[PDB]
Design a protein around this ligand. Sequence first.
Ligand SMILES: C[C@@H]1O[C@@H](O[C@H]2[C@H](O[C@H]3[C@H](O)[C@@H](O)[C@H](O)O[C@@H]3CO)O[C@H](CO)[C@H](O)[C@@H]2O)[C@@H](O)[C@H](O)[C@@H]1O
Ligand SMILES: [Ca+2]
Length: 132
Amino acid sequence: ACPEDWGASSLCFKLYAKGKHEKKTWFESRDFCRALGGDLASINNKEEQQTIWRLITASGSYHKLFWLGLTYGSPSEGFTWSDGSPVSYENWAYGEPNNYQNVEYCGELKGDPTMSWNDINCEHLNNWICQI
Ligand SMILES: C[C@@H]1O[C@@H](O[C@H]2[C@H](O[C@H]3[C@H](O)[C@@H](O)[C@H](O)O[C@@H]3CO)O[C@H](CO)[C@H](O)[C@@H]2O)[C@@H](O)[C@H](O)[C@@H]1O
Ligand SMILES: [Ca+2]
């Protein structure tokens, strides 16, 4: 059972699309989700991707960018999820991750129907999604 305000399919997810001045870095977003007892959202299969897409449609958060729990590990690991669990299912956008200019070590979701991922600099301010 998920809490009533969390979207379910299982993992539970919640969108945080806040004011223009209330976005957070990847690390700030991770700390926020962990303070709730959860973490930044991981997308581990097509069912979880659909759960989050339907959360986006229900909110009207179209076109927005969201932090996911994607973080680059060691060179041999590549991207992992924020709790260290491995990236198995992937939905990177075309050409991604491209580590553009060698400074992109966190992952963001483009919240449109493609639900694609991009690596981006971790100090960008974005919306975020938590899991619990
Ligand atoms: C926005 C960026 O998109 C991918 O990086 C691509 C890169 O983006 C350029 C964009 O074309 C340009 O309008 C903007 O002013 O600067 C961006 C770079 O920060 O463009 C190159 C072509 O030169 C490639 O197509 C890159 O894929 C994405 O990978 C980045 O993380 C970022 O979201
Ligand atoms: Ca990129």
